[PDB]
Amino acid sequence: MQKLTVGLIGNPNSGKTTLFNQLTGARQRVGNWAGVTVERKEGIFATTDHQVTLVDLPGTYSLTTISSQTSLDEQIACHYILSGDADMLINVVDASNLERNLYLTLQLLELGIPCVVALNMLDIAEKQQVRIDIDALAARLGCPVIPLVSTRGRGIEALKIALDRHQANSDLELVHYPQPLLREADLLAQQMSAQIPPRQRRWLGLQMLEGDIYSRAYAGDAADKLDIALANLSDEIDDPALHIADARYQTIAAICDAVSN
Ligand SMILES: Nc1nc2c(ncn2[C@@H]2O[C@H](COP(=O)(O)OP(=O)(O)O)[C@@H](O)[C@H]2O)c(=O)[nH]1
């Protein structure tokens, strides 16, 4: 029995609290994110091989801020995910709004954090005549995808086995970004703290290029973005932030269509 730290993440209203309580029962403590007002719930449970600490993370639709005035809430889950204190994540997805929920899902697989998706609200999706091919969705995301109805407590056991068994998401060419954006995101990548693993480094350069406000603080060379963007003014010219998003959205668009009836 190894101790294992899992983060619980999701868009707001994906049924994350329900799930938190199904997993931890009465064994949960209420605290706050360090130096701040936002509440940090955390609790515990045991699968066949791990004694897990589950750390609830604030709802967010996206990790990336292109923006100024988002929130403190939405801005903290990035920070935690990137710190490494979590060994794997549970991604709570509202099956009834897949395409919209998968933006966040897809940023996490791009970060590379081991990840199991809790496809929650399978009953709401049926009531809307939405059928989803789970096996197919897992084959496209590269990570387990486990069916849930948190209200009833359906799937909690399979969600746990999944966590016992999953180690590493499948290594996938998920989003096709245009080459110049990549070339700069690696330029930006390769001049950053070596503790930060290579995928995450890359991901952050993409984020920097895209406009992310609070990403500049992990880089150690944002002294250096202004020139990345200029070297691009020729190439995938007008708008890096457009083509960056577009590529993720087409990815998620294609997935959703492969797999929803
Ligand atoms: N019908 C249905 N409702 C759910 C399911 N999961 C959570 N809910 C309900 O969805 C609403 C959102 O729940 P909550 O856990 O607070 O969402 P959170 O903000 O994302 O934590 C609540 O009324 C829950 O009772 C589910 O699988 N099916």
Q: How many other C-beta atoms can be found within 10 angstroms of the C-beta atom of residue 27?
A: 12
Q: How many other C-beta atoms can be found within 10 angstroms of the C-beta atom of residue 2?
A: 8
The distance of Cα 210 from the centroid of its chain, to the nearest Å, equals 17
What is the DSSP code string of the chain?
A: -EEEEEEEEE-TTSSHHHHHHHHHTT-EEEEE-TTSSSEEEEEEEE-SSEEEEEEE----S-S---SSSS-SHHHHHHHHHHHT--SEEEEEEEGGGHHHHHHHHHHHHHHT--EEEEEE-HHHHHHTT--B-HHHHHHHHSS-EEE-BTTTTBTHHHHHHHHHH--S----------HHHHHHHHHHHTTS-TTS-HHHHHHHHHHHHHT-TTTHHHHS--TTHHHHHHHHHHSS-S-HHHHHHHHHHHHHHHHHHHHB-
Domain 175-261 of CATH type 1.10.287.1770: yes
User: What sign for the dihedral angle of Cα 84, 61, 156, 171?
Assistant: negative
Class of domain 1-174: alpha beta
Whether 16 contacts 92, CB under 8 Å: yes
For tokens 């994906």, name the residue.
14
For the CA of 120, the closest atom of ligand 1 is 27
Would you say the CB of residue 53 lies under 6 angstroms from ligand 1? no
Termini Cα distance of the chain:
41
- Specify the amino acid at residue 67: S
Would you say the CB of residue 124 lies under 6 angstroms from ligand 1? yes
For the CA of 21, the closest atom of ligand 1 is 15
Q: Domain ranges in the chain?
A: 1-174, 175-261
Named by the residue before each, gaps in the chain exceeding 2.5 A from C to N are: none
Distance between CA atoms of residues 76 and 163, nearest Å: 23
Q: How was this structure determined?
A: X-ray
